[PDB]
Write a protein that binds this DNA or RNA. Structure first.
Ligand SMILES: [Zn+2]
Lengths: 93, 54, 181, 81, 96, 94, 96, 83
DNA sequence: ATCACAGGATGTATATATCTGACACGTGCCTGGAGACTAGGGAGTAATCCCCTTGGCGGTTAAAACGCGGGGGACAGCGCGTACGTGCGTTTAAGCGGTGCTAGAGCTGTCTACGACCAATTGAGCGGCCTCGGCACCGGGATTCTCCAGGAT
DNA sequence: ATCCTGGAGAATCCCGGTGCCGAGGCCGCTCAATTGGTCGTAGACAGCTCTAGCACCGCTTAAACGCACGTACGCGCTGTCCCCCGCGTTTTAACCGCCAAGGGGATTACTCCCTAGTCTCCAGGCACGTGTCAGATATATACATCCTGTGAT
């Protein structure tokens, strides 16, 4: 009898952008649906890219390419910039 | 269905066109593949009545 | 029987379970014609009572003319495998004529399955009358044989004489009933 | 290799329109049509490039075009798949 | 000085183009259009001839479908002639 | 040499049952190959989801069946179900 | 006497319904419609209240989007009143 | 017990309100019927898929997720009722 | 002044003969399918707990249904004029075929850094709990809309 | 018939207080993340082959380009008419809160058995090769559809 969600992380992010803003349980539920939708897609595409190129491993590159295929304009771009860094840093961390 | 199209055209085989005609004439296949573009499929010969004279 | 067909099939009214009823179609076919012939005003047309199913309707025009009307279903599918070895013209009119003909439709006529001591009511029999006509008029492997006196053969003549022989004998002995069938 | 959109001849545009059942074409259609065709091509080509790049290639293959089209609700049959 | 009236030929062309399957857009022109677009993403890019054809068929298929809807819009508007706006409406309804 | 797989051989055979006297162009065959791979992926893809949704590691004849019902429309979907249901019933009986 | 003219209120209502977020379709009626439809496929068919609401919002969202396109079609046709054919065009273009 | 004619449960004001939200100013009398005949198809498609999913899972009660999958299958996603 | 007909003009479908290259069929591999085997984790089954759906009751209230009058938009009909279609003659570059170059796809073989896997430890996150604060609702007043009358255009 | 204030009459915004129940923070605890070590193989890399994509040339010729004529179409304007809208009064059933019953979803514990993974062996299927027939091309003939004149009505 236990579930998991991103409610706690979404809450925190709101503060990074709007330190004084709260959030309803529904808005949170909506954000949870959003996160899971985007997650599935990127993971789906990353799988496929590995598949198309006849590979077994998903790397940061497949994630990057998947991001571009799904996201339009700058959102795709800022996401790539951020993803690149997190990996670059995590390694050196 | 494509074979029937081939026969309609007095042929002994199926070509991409016959596949297109078959798929589209059959409502349920028309839908199953309703987003499919067939290389050299052409289109159905549907002409709007309002464009025709008396 | 009819295959999957999404849209409404208007012949549904003749279905009996899954099967297209030869009995219903023939019965209704003659019923329609009967009502309609009574609307023929300049010509006197009388309908005969039906006995078999090969001629759906026999019409009697004045005192001289009779007309046998056969109803047939048309199918444009490839012919059934049982016809695979039929139309045995390969050595006569050629394999290529045979192939051409088989790209054409075949027909089904309402016909009870006549058998040893009875019959099935809703069966249909395969019909190739259109091919028979094409053959009679294309009886040569030259295919234009007889349309020109240089290539005049007696196939057509022999058949007419054979038909005439049987018909004459049937007329001769129509009373002894030996030849009715 | 510039404004090659003009390489799409007027008759070429009209013929497509005809195939679509179009009987009469306004004189302003040619340009409007181009503004749409171009966007379509831009979206498809770019994805194909993205796939090509991912794969570390320089030549765009039919398969890269197919993936680009596919995802837009457009599977194309005939070039593999 | 025999002539066929306006619309007689137009319908004829419609019949034919619906019937046939061949590409209507000239190839070398189309191929170059692809490249001009491509060079805006990347220089020194190459294409297989089958890739160009794949693009062309999809491109024509797109436009034809667009024209069919455009034609319906013009008819809805009680008109035979299609105008830029009829294209725009169809696209919009489609989510573009 | 490297080697490629297709359904060309199976497509021919099916063609013979519907139209014993007809052939097929190389393009129509290429199209039928594109077709088969498309349908396969969809059914397998949906079947994948059903297995995931219902907390399974295995795809069975049911996940295939349900995927068929969801993907195919009207009656066409049905014949596919009838034939599949049977083929399994039969396979283990053959 | 005093009243607003035809169209004054309609514009007002457009503003208001665009503005508000609630359901426009009555709940029990909608719920029953769902069941009436459901009872075609099978019996023993039960619904959670959250399932019915999920259906209702999706259903309203669908119709509203359809009406937006319908309205545009009516405008395209130079009209204010929407008619069944404006709905039909919009749907057809969508590919329904 | 069996139900019926709840298509009328979608009342005239309800249709108008939807139309108005969509920017529709003026509505022909025949729209009501025409609209219902379209709403109905939409509902049929979504409900059916939800049922299909429900049946696959061998359940009797339809949950929000069954509806969500059904709507996703038709390509119209819905947030806040699961995901 | 309109109907239909006949003739011409044009374009289509038709049979015919010949050409060629794309299919249909056969050969020889060779590697993926099928059979045979063990091992163990997932799926099936039943227990049973209790949460949530169903059904029912009675008030109470807003929301629907109905009817009436009247303005306003939909529609049909008319006429203007211009923006397209059709056909002719001239210009263009597309398509075809062939040539020649080499850039980059595609495959092979080697080696090693990376991730699956497993066992141990623990603290980040989920469920349940209380607290009270932002939001929804009530009632009153301010002022910001729409619409008509009467006096200008 | 149309523009310009100025008032009357609703409708919508803003103000301040009630009160409630949904968010937000705290505590226990438990099981999913983290660490640390081992194994083996997927992927990185270099090397080499040779397919096929690019660039260029010249010739043939069917398409594209531009122009002139003229007329079917789009557009705007007018008037009818009828059918929606807006309001008020009557009628309905949706909604709310409360209650009880029990059906079926969710979790538990246990056990096979139905699959994955392994090795062995052979025939089904793919790459290549070859022959000839179907469809494409082109010729020429005959039938069908379209559009002005032309008499009949
Ligand atoms: Zn002869």
């Amino acid at each position: 009898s236990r579930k998991e969600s991103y409610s706690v992380y979404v809450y925190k992010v709101l503060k990074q952008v709007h330190p004084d803003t709260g959030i309803s349980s529904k808005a949170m539920g909506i954000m949870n649906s959003f996160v899971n939708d985007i997650f599935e897609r990127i993971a789906g595409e990353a799988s496929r890219l590995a598949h198309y190129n006849k590979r077994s491993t998903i790397t940061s590159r497949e994630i990057q390419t998947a991001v571009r295929l799904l996201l339009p304009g700058e959102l795709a771009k800022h996401a790539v910039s951020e993803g690149t860094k997190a990996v670059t840093k995590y390694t050196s961390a | 269905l494509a074979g029937n199209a081939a026969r309609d055209n007095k042929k002994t085989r199926i070509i991409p066109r016959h596949l297109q005609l078959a798929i589209r004439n059959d409502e349920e296949l028309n839908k199953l593949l309703g987003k499919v573009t067939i290389a050299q499929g052409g289109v159905l010969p549907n002409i709007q009545a309002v464009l025709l004279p008396k | 029987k009819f295959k999957r067909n999404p849209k409404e099939n208007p012949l549904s009214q003749f279905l009996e379970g899954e099967i297209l009823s030869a009995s219903k179609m023939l019965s209704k076919f003659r019923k329609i014609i009967k009502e309609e012939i009574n609307d023929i005003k300049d010509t006197d047309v009388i309908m005969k009572r039906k006995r078999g199913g090969s001629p759906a309707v026999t019409l009697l025009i004045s005192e001289k003319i009779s007309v046998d009307i056969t109803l047939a279903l048309e199918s444009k599918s490839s012919w059934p495998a049982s016809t695979q070895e039929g139309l045995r013209i390969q050595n006569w009119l050629s394999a290529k004529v045979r192939k051409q003909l088989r790209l054409k439709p075949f027909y089904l006529v309402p016909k009870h399955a006549k058998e040893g001591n009875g019959f099935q009511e809703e069966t249909w029999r395969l019909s190739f009358s259109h091919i028979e006509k094409e053959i009679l008029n294309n009886h040569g492997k030259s295919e234009t044989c007889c349309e020109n006196k240089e290539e005049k053969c007696c196939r057509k003549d022999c058949l007419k004489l054979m038909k005439y022989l049987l018909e004459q004998l049937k007329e001769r002995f129509k009373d002894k009933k030996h030849l009715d069938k | 290799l510039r404004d090659n959109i003009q390489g799409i001849t007027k008759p070429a545009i009209r013929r497509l329109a005809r195939r679509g059942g179009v009987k009469r074409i306004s004189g302003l259609i040619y340009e409007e049509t181009r503004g749409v065709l171009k966007v379509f091509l831009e979206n498809v080509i770019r994805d194909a490039v993205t796939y090509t790049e991912h794969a570390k290639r320089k030549t765009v293959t039919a398969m890269d075009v197919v993936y680009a089209l596919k995802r837009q609700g457009r599977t194309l049959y005939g070039f593999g798949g | 000085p025999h002539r066929y009236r306006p619309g007689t030929v137009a319908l004829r062309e419609i019949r034919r183009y619906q019937k046939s399957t061949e590409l209507l857009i000239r190839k070398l022109p189309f191929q170059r259009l692809v490249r001009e677009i491509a060079q805006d993403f990347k220089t020194d890019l190459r294409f297989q001839s089958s890739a160009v054809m794949a693009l062309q068929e999809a491109s024509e298929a797109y436009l034809v479908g667009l024209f069919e809807d455009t034609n319906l819009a013009a008819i809805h508007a009680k008109r035979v002639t299609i105008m830029p706006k009829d294209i725009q409406l169809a696209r919009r309804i489609r989510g573009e």
